[PDB]
Amino acid sequence: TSEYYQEAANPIATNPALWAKVTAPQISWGSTDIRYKKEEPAPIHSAQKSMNLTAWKGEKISAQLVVWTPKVLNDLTFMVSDLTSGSATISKENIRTGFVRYVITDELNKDGLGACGYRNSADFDSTLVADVIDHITPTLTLPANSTQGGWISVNIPQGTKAGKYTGTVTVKADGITLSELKLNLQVKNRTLPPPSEWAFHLDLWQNPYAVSRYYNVEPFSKKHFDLMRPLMKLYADAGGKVITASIMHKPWNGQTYDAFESMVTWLKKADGTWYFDYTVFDKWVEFMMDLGVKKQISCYSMVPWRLSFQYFDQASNSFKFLDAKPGEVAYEEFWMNMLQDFSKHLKAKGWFDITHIAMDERPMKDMQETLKVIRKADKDFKVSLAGTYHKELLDDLNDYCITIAEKFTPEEIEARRKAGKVTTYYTCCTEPRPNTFTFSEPAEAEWLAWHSAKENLDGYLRWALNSWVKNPLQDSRFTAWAAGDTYMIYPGARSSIRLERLTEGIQFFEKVRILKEEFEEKGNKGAIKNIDKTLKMFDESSMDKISPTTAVNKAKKVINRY
Amino acid sequence: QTSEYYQEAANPIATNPALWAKVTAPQISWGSTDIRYKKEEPAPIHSAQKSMNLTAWKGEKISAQLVVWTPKVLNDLTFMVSDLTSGSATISKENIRTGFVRYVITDELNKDGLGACGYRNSADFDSTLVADVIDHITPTLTLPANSTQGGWISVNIPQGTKAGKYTGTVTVKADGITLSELKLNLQVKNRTLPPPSEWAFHLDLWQNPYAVSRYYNVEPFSKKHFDLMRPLMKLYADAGGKVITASIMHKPWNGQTYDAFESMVTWLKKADGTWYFDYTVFDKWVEFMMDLGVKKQISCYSMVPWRLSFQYFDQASNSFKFLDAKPGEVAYEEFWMNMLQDFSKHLKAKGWFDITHIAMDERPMKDMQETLKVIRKADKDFKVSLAGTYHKELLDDLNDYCITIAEKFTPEEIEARRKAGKVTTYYTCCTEPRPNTFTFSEPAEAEWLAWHSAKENLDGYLRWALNSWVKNPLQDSRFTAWAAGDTYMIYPGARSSIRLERLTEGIQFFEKVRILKEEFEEKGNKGAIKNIDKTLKMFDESSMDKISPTTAVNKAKKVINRY
Ligand SMILES: CC1=N[C@@H]2[C@@H](O)[C@@H](O)[C@@H](CO)O[C@@H]2S1
Ligand SMILES: CC1=N[C@@H]2[C@@H](O)[C@@H](O)[C@@H](CO)O[C@@H]2S1
């Protein structure tokens, strides 16, 4: 109820001429590849009344329906039935419905070659786009001449018996039924493990400070964790493996609407001794582990974007700053002290094996000077970098994440896989496509996971799960970057089109891995070669002969035939 | 001549040898001007049609397509046409243009089939070669094994040709020897169609001179530039073109086309507060088009350019600066009054003021009203035009008003506008799947457009791009926006399109319908007027699904030619 909301005003006026051949309200299955605009009729010639889906046991699969009306429709609703198949059933508890709601977005930089740098919103276009999966609001009133998408997620349980299942989606308005769309689902005799058991390394950096701000509650209070639980569950259920921690004040110098505070207390006592306390850090880590996010903790950062380190100075009873750089003796002395304490603490908690000291796009020289400090503190501290490819760092880094344009050699990837290291890629503001801006094509998000599979990478990294702007449900623009850069989940614990398509891609990554292990076990070199040539579609420079949407849909069909 | 020869793009569709196994020898036949014959398949013709019966008025241009398809390589394919003889009287072969109907890359409507608007990545759509370019320049072509090639034949019938039946021969040669002699019969009736200069039909196809200077890499408005444009724009004059496009400021459409329109007027702000304006480009362009026969109207774009940022040469900084200002602002009014008052004097001095329209493209109501006030304050007699949405409020203020096809003026509104000497037309753009002139549109759609003007008692038709060429217009007609072919209808080398030739035939029939009604009103002929009018009801934009554009057009041609 407190999560109900109003969308922003459409910056595009509705054109009555576009709506003149719409005589009655129209209800049809649509496509999960499409963001239907609010102010235009759905681009669908013909009412498609049936939907054929194919899926594995355990898989989450989705479909979009669409409603558009020349008249006002009050209290629009859709329920879905059980899915029946002779004697066996998929309960409707396993089916989430939501209204695909509209958020303000912009566009790429004026040149079309990137989306990096500061922005005044006045200098760019402004539109509404369908991105939010609103599973909370039970009904909506559609105005005259407007369109509204409906997202339907089907969670197929593990125990479900292989066969063809039939079901009904019932759209109502004003208290009366407008249409019964049919839904067929072919469940195959192959099982997809739960999210907890997926190999895919998904790192989407979390900002707890954005949630405390938006809801105006005290950080790390009961209320704060209660609001974050379903929100972060979305991340766990997409296969999230990495817990973000800020072990010092402002690791990214407040580049986001909400700055990261320190989850560690840095106390310099007046007698030369230090006192460190990890109570916040521990509560945050324990909380995320509880949700199923447990493979890695990434601590930002020893090389924060501004080289100014906050500490509580007891002598003056105040916050002071140490200005110090990697390569300075004072920098080393300051960090050795903390890291040696942090190391003991982490071993006592049983988290040391998984805890990485983490850096974001720092230069070569600084990384080398920083590594020396780290190794001197503890030889077994794990380290991560999301940044530029450097042959010099391949052995020192346990999680190495590289821009999409750059590549590890297959030799380098095998050695890294063999040694239990993690090897991923990212996109950021640089790359017009593929990306997860609110205006990006939905299939782009899915494409990202397939690209991991083509490159034999472990997964994918993006720098902002939920670094919300002021009013994230209404307006996704920020003072920097393309709109949507800073988040992919919304308040109320509402998923995005982007995150659901990414999750589907991740599921197919897992399927590709399971099929290859089976085909290596049998003698099946025909199947391996075929899968591998489907995967060559996911090259960042073959997007102009084969579009992301075409690529994805081709490859889905292929894997689902095996 | 030689510098206009070119290679087509690679076919995105592979040729299938199985489709060609029942083709034993090369085949030559008359075809249809309603059809774009695919390159990679044999012509869909199960019998060689050796004769072609055409009917035409004196003065009329009439066409026919022949088709050649071959299982083997044919070197130096050529076709000449003879004189057409009829007892003692003759139509010289100088009056007959032949061309190879050549292939251009195209796409398709938006995925839904309901429009063709919006930005596009070419990866997201189909890609095919389609027959559109009438190549009258290249004298021969070498056909590869398993391919089809259409040939367009335009017969310009002179005024004063004597009424009767004319016989003639089309001779197709290859490798230096004759493959076939197709026969061509032409029934010339005892009714005469005036030259293009005398057609009532108001055809406005906006011209882009900047595309021609770019593509040939020559200096804009130089001798070479005008020489390349002369035959190119002749195609427009000879289709009945009435309107000269002028850009009186920098980028009136904010570079929506591959080549942006630059300003044909120099806007110099001197450092002492005075302005200097020079119209030398504007004048040379206008004089040049008037010389070709395009003289009824000049349309100057625009006071409401698509981005409200007006360029001027700032002398004080010796640089280009921009004024950001909107209709309804005092600064906007001051900036334009100054220019328009100078422009008005200039236009009167040249004798062009009566025909010069300040022109706008799809702008809102409020902005048009605020802009009109500025215009009227500059000069009360400035004429104004709008291609856009129907608004009752603007009917008196606009001397040329062009409305989307989906919207309609009342017959009362059309009579008042005709009575006052105002012009009243319609357009299609990217919105309308049919009828249109995309490179994939059915050829008859182009002709249907002119008949639709005749059904609605409109003066003519407007389209927004005669020649706003993409990078390689002969090869690939796709653009970063819209259906392929939206941005142009004539090609480099001054080559017509299937689209423009069919549109021209439709325009000719518009003129014939007008002449027959004036005769039938003058006689007592109520039977004929009622019949013509019921033929015309076929050209309704929502009767296309019971009667196809091709069927409509051919039906109506027969009917008019019986009278
Ligand atoms: C791994 C990354 N690190 C940087 C982040 O801190 C943000 O600045 C982001 C903006 O798109 O760009 C890159 S992505
Ligand atoms: C009268 C017209 N004006 C507009 C033009 O400037 C182009 O944008 C065109 C694209 O199809 O659409 C409409 S048609």
For residue B337, the one-letter residue type is M
Residues B241, B295 contacting (CB under 8 angstroms) = no
Nearest of A57, A75, A70, A63 to residue A14 by alpha carbon? A70
Token couple for B272: 């002492």
Q: Angle at Cα A512 formed by Cα A510 and Cα A515, nearest 5°?
A: 110
Residues of chain A with CATH 2.60.40.10: 16-191
CA distance B327 to chain A (A): 19
- The dihedral over CA atoms of B250, B256, B261, B265, expressed in degrees to the nearest 10, equals -30
Residues A233, A291 contacting (CB under 8 angstroms) = yes
Residues of A in contact with B404 (CB under 8 A): 17
Q: State yes or no: cis peptide before A81, omega within 30 of 0.
A: no
| CB–CB contact B114 A45 (8 Å) | yes
Residue of A nearest to B389 (CA): A17
Residues B459, B114 contacting (CB under 8 angstroms) = no
Q: How far, in Å, CA of B324 to CA of B331, rounded?
A: 9
Q: Angle at Cα A69 formed by Cα A68 and Cα A70, nearest 5°?
A: 140
Residues of A in contact with B110 (CB under 8 A): 43
DSSP string, A208-261: HHHHHHHHT--TTSHHHHHHHHHHHHHHHHTTB-EEEEE-SS-TTTT-SSSPPP
Q: How far, in Å, CA of A251 to CA of A260, rounded?
A: 7
Residues of B in contact with A44 (CB under 8 A): 112
Nearest CA to ligand 2 atom 5: B464
* Fold of the domain built from segment(s) B2-192: Immunoglobulin-like (2.60.40)
Q: Is A402 in the pocket of ligand 1 (CB under 6 A)?
A: no
Resolution value, angstrom units: 2.3
B392 C-alpha to ligand 2 centroid (Å) = 22
The experimental method, as deposited, was X-ray
Q: How far, in Å, CA of B227 to CA of B212, rounded?
A: 11
Pocket-testing residue among B464, B466, B468, B470, ligand 2, by greatest number of atoms within 8 A of Cβ: B464
Q: Strands, E, within B175-296: which ranges?
A: 177-192, 202-205, 243-247, 266-269, 275-278
CA A310 to chain centre: 30
CA A336 to chain centre: 34
Q: Looking at residue B119, what DSSP letter applies?
A: B
Q: How far, in Å, CA of B77 to CA of B176, rounded?
A: 8
For residue A207, the one-letter residue type is N
Rounded to the nearest 10 degrees, the angle between the axes of helix A548-561 and helix A525-535 is 160
Of A20, A45, A546, the CB nearest to B123: A546
What 3-state class would DSSP assign to B471?
A: coil
Residues B504, B193 contacting (CB under 8 angstroms) = no
Residues B259, B214 contacting (CB under 8 angstroms) = yes
Q: Looking at residue B241, what DSSP letter applies?
A: B
CA distance A538 to chain B (A): 14
Pairing of strands B356-361, B383-388: parallel
Q: Which residues pair with B280 in a beta bridge?
A: none
Token couple for B44: 């869909």
What 3-state class would DSSP assign to B499?
A: helix
Token couple for B81: 């046409």
Considering only CA atoms, give the Rg of chain A. Answer: 25
Unique residue bearing structure tokens 């559609």: A142
Other CB atoms within 10 A of residue A365 CB: 11
Ligand 1 atom closest to the Cα of residue A361 is 3
Q: Angle at Cα B114 formed by Cα B109 and Cα B115, nearest 5°?
A: 55
- Give me the CATH code for the A16-191 domain, please: 2.60.40.10
Nearest of A44, A5, A4 to residue A22 by alpha carbon? A44
- The dihedral over CA atoms of A381, A386, A391, A392, expressed in degrees to the nearest 10, equals -40
Token couple for A5: 């909301």
DSSP string, B260-272: PPPPSSEEEE-TT
Residues B308, B363 contacting (CB under 8 angstroms) = no
For residue B425, the one-letter residue type is T
Residue B183: CB partners within 8 Å, gap ≥ 6?
Answer: B50, B51, B52, B167, B168, B169, B170
Q: State yes or no: cis peptide before B247, omega within 30 of 0.
A: no
What 3-state class would DSSP assign to A508?
A: helix
Token couple for A19: 């709506």
